Every structure is written in structure tokens, then in C-alpha cells.
Amino acid sequence: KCPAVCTCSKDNALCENARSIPRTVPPDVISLSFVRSGFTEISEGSFLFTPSLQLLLFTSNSFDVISDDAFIGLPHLEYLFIENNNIKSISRHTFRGLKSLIHLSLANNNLQTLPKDIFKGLDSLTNVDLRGNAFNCDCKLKWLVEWLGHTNATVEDIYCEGPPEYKKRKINSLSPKDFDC
Ligand SMILES: *[C@@H]1O[C@H](CO)[C@@H](O)[C@H](O)[C@H]1NC(C)=O
């Protein structure tokens, strides 16, 4: 019942160098991890067949895009860890539909921006980790300051990698005037 690419513990499944997201994952596996995966993107509805996941981890992957509604069909997911990845693009609705998500980690992916309203609709979120990314502070990030001010979640300090004028400045400290636009 455990997928061939993955090795499965009782409640946990680890998939390494998987060429596709398995749709056969046994129920009563609440945690799934993808390490050094073969697949280059996460399309919409990839996890539809694994509704029981409370925890998801992506690490050491190279992704062209993580699509809108990629995580649709995961009503029970509390923890989502996307870390130490190469991600070229992240869609505004990528995380749409996770109401139960408590902890979200984008940390250490070297992401240059984030789209507006990417955190829209995640109510249960107590923690977001944006550290370890190279953020270009510009018009596309201007929303992020407003979100950091009004957010209920705990977010540790993050800094602008660019442009040269703003480098190594706390994004939380910035004001909307400084963003140009
Ligand atoms: C943070 O949460 C409290 C209670 O959960 C709420 O009253 C407050 O308005 C929230 N902050 C916002 C929405 O900026």
C-alpha cells in the first residue's frame, strides 16, 4: 500500500527522488515529505487523493512553479514546510483552501518576491517563517509590510536583499513611501 518511490513508517511517509506526486498514499499517514524530487512543479489538485495529511514537507527540490490551488483538498493540514528549495515562481492562490494551517515555512528558499494576498484566507496561522530568502524590496513586496503590521501570526524579522539602497534593512521597518511605485 506504501508507494514504491516512498518508504513508509506507521503514520509517516518519506518520498525521495519521486518522479510524480503519489495518489496512492495509505490513509492514516498524516505526514508526507518530498526530498530531492524528480518532478519539477506542483500542479493544481496534486494532493486531492491524500486528504488525511496534517503535515507536508518539501525540501531540496527544484521547482519551476507551485501552481494556484496546488494544496486544494487538504482540509486537515496544520503544518506545511517548504524549505531549502529552488522555486522560480509562486502563484497568488498557491495556498488557497488551507484553513487549518497553523505553521507555514517558506524559509531558506532564496525567493525574490511573494505575490499579494498569498497569505489571504489562512485563518488558523499562528506562525510564518520567511527568513533565509533574498527578497527584492519593490512594488511587488509593498503589500508585505501592510500584512506584517496587521497579521495575527508570529513572523521573525526578515531583511531586503535588494535593491542596493535598501539592502540589509528590516522589511517590517520599511514604510510604503520607501517602496517607490
Ligand atoms: C489579531 O487577533 C485578535 C484576536 O484573535 C484580533 O482581535 C485582532 O483584530 C487581530 N489583528 C488584526 C486582525 O490585525
Short mmCIF file of all heavy atoms in Angstrom, two decimals, residues 139-163:
data_model
loop_
_atom_site.label_atom_id
_atom_site.label_comp_id
_atom_site.label_asym_id
_atom_site.label_seq_id
_atom_site.Cartn_x
_atom_site.Cartn_y
_atom_site.Cartn_z
N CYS A 139 7.83 47.30 -5.60
CA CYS A 139 6.38 47.39 -5.65
C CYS A 139 5.68 46.05 -5.41
O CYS A 139 4.61 46.01 -4.80
CB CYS A 139 5.98 48.00 -6.99
SG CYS A 139 6.85 49.54 -7.10
N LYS A 140 6.28 44.95 -5.86
CA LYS A 140 5.64 43.65 -5.67
C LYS A 140 5.63 43.22 -4.20
O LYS A 140 4.78 42.40 -3.83
CB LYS A 140 6.32 42.59 -6.54
CG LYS A 140 6.21 42.91 -8.03
CD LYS A 140 6.53 41.72 -8.94
CE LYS A 140 7.98 41.27 -8.85
NZ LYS A 140 8.26 40.19 -9.85
N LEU A 141 6.55 43.72 -3.38
CA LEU A 141 6.56 43.43 -1.95
C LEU A 141 5.83 44.46 -1.09
O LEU A 141 5.69 44.24 0.12
CB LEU A 141 8.00 43.32 -1.43
CG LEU A 141 8.74 41.99 -1.59
CD1 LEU A 141 10.04 42.02 -0.80
CD2 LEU A 141 7.86 40.85 -1.11
N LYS A 142 5.36 45.57 -1.66
CA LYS A 142 4.82 46.66 -0.85
C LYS A 142 3.70 46.17 0.07
O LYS A 142 3.58 46.63 1.22
CB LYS A 142 4.31 47.79 -1.75
CG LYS A 142 3.81 49.02 -1.00
CD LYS A 142 3.60 50.17 -1.97
CE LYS A 142 3.00 51.38 -1.29
NZ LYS A 142 1.58 51.15 -0.90
N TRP A 143 2.89 45.22 -0.40
CA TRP A 143 1.82 44.65 0.42
C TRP A 143 2.38 43.98 1.67
O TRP A 143 1.73 43.98 2.72
CB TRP A 143 1.04 43.62 -0.40
CG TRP A 143 1.86 42.41 -0.74
CD1 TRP A 143 2.68 42.26 -1.82
CD2 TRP A 143 1.95 41.20 0.01
NE1 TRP A 143 3.27 41.02 -1.79
CE2 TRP A 143 2.84 40.35 -0.67
CE3 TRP A 143 1.36 40.74 1.19
CZ2 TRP A 143 3.16 39.07 -0.21
CZ3 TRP A 143 1.67 39.47 1.65
CH2 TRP A 143 2.56 38.65 0.95
N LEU A 144 3.57 43.38 1.56
CA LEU A 144 4.10 42.55 2.64
C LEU A 144 4.23 43.32 3.94
O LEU A 144 3.98 42.77 5.02
CB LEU A 144 5.45 41.95 2.24
CG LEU A 144 6.04 40.92 3.20
CD1 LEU A 144 4.99 39.86 3.53
CD2 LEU A 144 7.29 40.28 2.63
N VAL A 145 4.62 44.59 3.88
CA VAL A 145 4.73 45.40 5.09
C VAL A 145 3.36 45.56 5.74
O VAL A 145 3.19 45.35 6.95
CB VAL A 145 5.36 46.77 4.78
CG1 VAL A 145 5.34 47.65 6.01
CG2 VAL A 145 6.78 46.58 4.29
N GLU A 146 2.35 45.93 4.94
CA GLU A 146 0.99 46.07 5.45
C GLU A 146 0.50 44.78 6.08
O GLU A 146 -0.17 44.80 7.12
CB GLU A 146 0.06 46.50 4.31
CG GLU A 146 -1.41 46.58 4.68
CD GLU A 146 -2.27 47.10 3.54
OE1 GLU A 146 -1.72 47.35 2.44
OE2 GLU A 146 -3.50 47.23 3.73
N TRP A 147 0.84 43.64 5.48
CA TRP A 147 0.43 42.36 6.05
C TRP A 147 1.16 42.10 7.37
O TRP A 147 0.55 41.63 8.33
CB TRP A 147 0.69 41.23 5.06
CG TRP A 147 0.28 39.90 5.59
CD1 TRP A 147 -0.99 39.40 5.65
CD2 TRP A 147 1.13 38.90 6.17
NE1 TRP A 147 -0.98 38.15 6.22
CE2 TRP A 147 0.31 37.82 6.55
CE3 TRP A 147 2.51 38.82 6.39
CZ2 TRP A 147 0.82 36.67 7.14
CZ3 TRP A 147 3.01 37.68 6.99
CH2 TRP A 147 2.17 36.62 7.35
N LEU A 148 2.47 42.39 7.42
CA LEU A 148 3.24 42.19 8.64
C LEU A 148 2.71 43.03 9.79
O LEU A 148 2.73 42.60 10.95
CB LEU A 148 4.72 42.51 8.39
CG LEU A 148 5.54 41.57 7.50
CD1 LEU A 148 6.89 42.18 7.18
CD2 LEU A 148 5.71 40.22 8.17
N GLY A 149 2.24 44.25 9.50
CA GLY A 149 1.70 45.08 10.56
C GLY A 149 0.40 44.55 11.14
O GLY A 149 0.20 44.58 12.36
N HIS A 150 -0.50 44.08 10.29
CA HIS A 150 -1.85 43.69 10.69
C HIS A 150 -2.01 42.20 10.97
O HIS A 150 -3.12 41.76 11.25
CB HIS A 150 -2.85 44.12 9.62
CG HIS A 150 -2.85 45.59 9.34
ND1 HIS A 150 -3.31 46.52 10.25
CD2 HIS A 150 -2.45 46.29 8.26
CE1 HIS A 150 -3.19 47.73 9.74
NE2 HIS A 150 -2.67 47.62 8.53
N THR A 151 -0.94 41.41 10.88
CA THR A 151 -1.09 39.96 10.95
C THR A 151 -1.16 39.45 12.39
O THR A 151 -0.51 40.00 13.29
CB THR A 151 0.06 39.26 10.22
OG1 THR A 151 -0.17 37.84 10.21
CG2 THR A 151 1.39 39.55 10.90
N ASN A 152 -1.98 38.42 12.60
CA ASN A 152 -2.04 37.72 13.87
C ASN A 152 -0.89 36.74 14.06
O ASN A 152 -0.56 36.40 15.21
CB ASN A 152 -3.35 36.93 13.97
CG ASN A 152 -4.52 37.72 14.53
OD1 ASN A 152 -5.67 37.39 14.26
ND2 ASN A 152 -4.24 38.77 15.32
N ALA A 153 -0.27 36.29 12.98
CA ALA A 153 0.79 35.29 13.06
C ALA A 153 2.08 35.88 13.64
O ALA A 153 2.29 37.09 13.64
CB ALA A 153 1.06 34.69 11.69
N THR A 154 2.92 34.99 14.15
CA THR A 154 4.26 35.35 14.61
C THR A 154 5.23 35.21 13.44
O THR A 154 5.41 34.12 12.91
CB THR A 154 4.69 34.45 15.77
OG1 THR A 154 3.88 34.71 16.91
CG2 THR A 154 6.16 34.68 16.11
N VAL A 155 5.87 36.32 13.06
CA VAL A 155 6.81 36.33 11.95
C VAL A 155 8.10 36.96 12.42
O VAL A 155 8.11 38.11 12.87
CB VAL A 155 6.25 37.08 10.73
CG1 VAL A 155 7.20 36.94 9.54
CG2 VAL A 155 4.86 36.57 10.37
N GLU A 156 9.20 36.21 12.33
CA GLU A 156 10.50 36.73 12.70
C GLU A 156 11.00 37.72 11.66
O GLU A 156 10.56 37.73 10.50
CB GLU A 156 11.51 35.59 12.89
CG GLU A 156 11.17 34.63 14.02
CD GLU A 156 11.07 35.30 15.39
OE1 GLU A 156 11.66 36.39 15.58
OE2 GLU A 156 10.39 34.74 16.27
N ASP A 157 11.94 38.57 12.08
CA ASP A 157 12.42 39.65 11.23
C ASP A 157 13.10 39.12 9.96
O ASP A 157 13.87 38.16 10.00
CB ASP A 157 13.40 40.53 12.01
CG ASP A 157 12.73 41.21 13.18
OD1 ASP A 157 11.48 41.23 13.21
OD2 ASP A 157 13.44 41.71 14.09
N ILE A 158 12.78 39.76 8.84
CA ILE A 158 13.37 39.44 7.54
C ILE A 158 13.87 40.73 6.92
O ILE A 158 13.40 41.83 7.22
CB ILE A 158 12.38 38.72 6.61
CG1 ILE A 158 11.14 39.59 6.36
CG2 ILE A 158 11.97 37.38 7.19
CD1 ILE A 158 10.13 38.95 5.42
N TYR A 159 14.85 40.59 6.02
CA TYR A 159 15.59 41.72 5.50
C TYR A 159 15.59 41.73 3.98
O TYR A 159 15.49 40.69 3.33
CB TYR A 159 17.04 41.72 6.03
CG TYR A 159 17.15 41.55 7.53
CD1 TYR A 159 17.07 40.29 8.12
CD2 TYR A 159 17.33 42.65 8.36
CE1 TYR A 159 17.16 40.14 9.50
CE2 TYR A 159 17.44 42.50 9.73
CZ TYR A 159 17.35 41.25 10.29
OH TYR A 159 17.45 41.11 11.66
N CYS A 160 15.70 42.94 3.42
CA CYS A 160 15.77 43.12 1.98
C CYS A 160 17.15 42.72 1.46
O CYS A 160 18.18 43.20 1.95
CB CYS A 160 15.50 44.57 1.60
SG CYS A 160 13.93 45.28 2.14
N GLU A 161 17.18 41.83 0.46
CA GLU A 161 18.42 41.58 -0.26
C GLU A 161 18.71 42.67 -1.27
O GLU A 161 19.88 43.01 -1.51
CB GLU A 161 18.37 40.22 -0.95
CG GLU A 161 19.50 39.97 -1.94
CD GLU A 161 20.79 39.53 -1.27
OE1 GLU A 161 20.78 39.30 -0.04
OE2 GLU A 161 21.82 39.43 -1.97
N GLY A 162 17.67 43.26 -1.85
CA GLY A 162 17.80 44.34 -2.81
C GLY A 162 16.60 45.26 -2.73
O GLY A 162 15.65 44.97 -2.01
N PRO A 163 16.66 46.41 -3.42
CA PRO A 163 17.75 46.92 -4.26
C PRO A 163 18.93 47.40 -3.41
O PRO A 163 18.80 47.37 -2.19
CB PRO A 163 17.08 48.08 -5.00
CG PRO A 163 16.08 48.59 -4.03
CD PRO A 163 15.54 47.37 -3.34
#
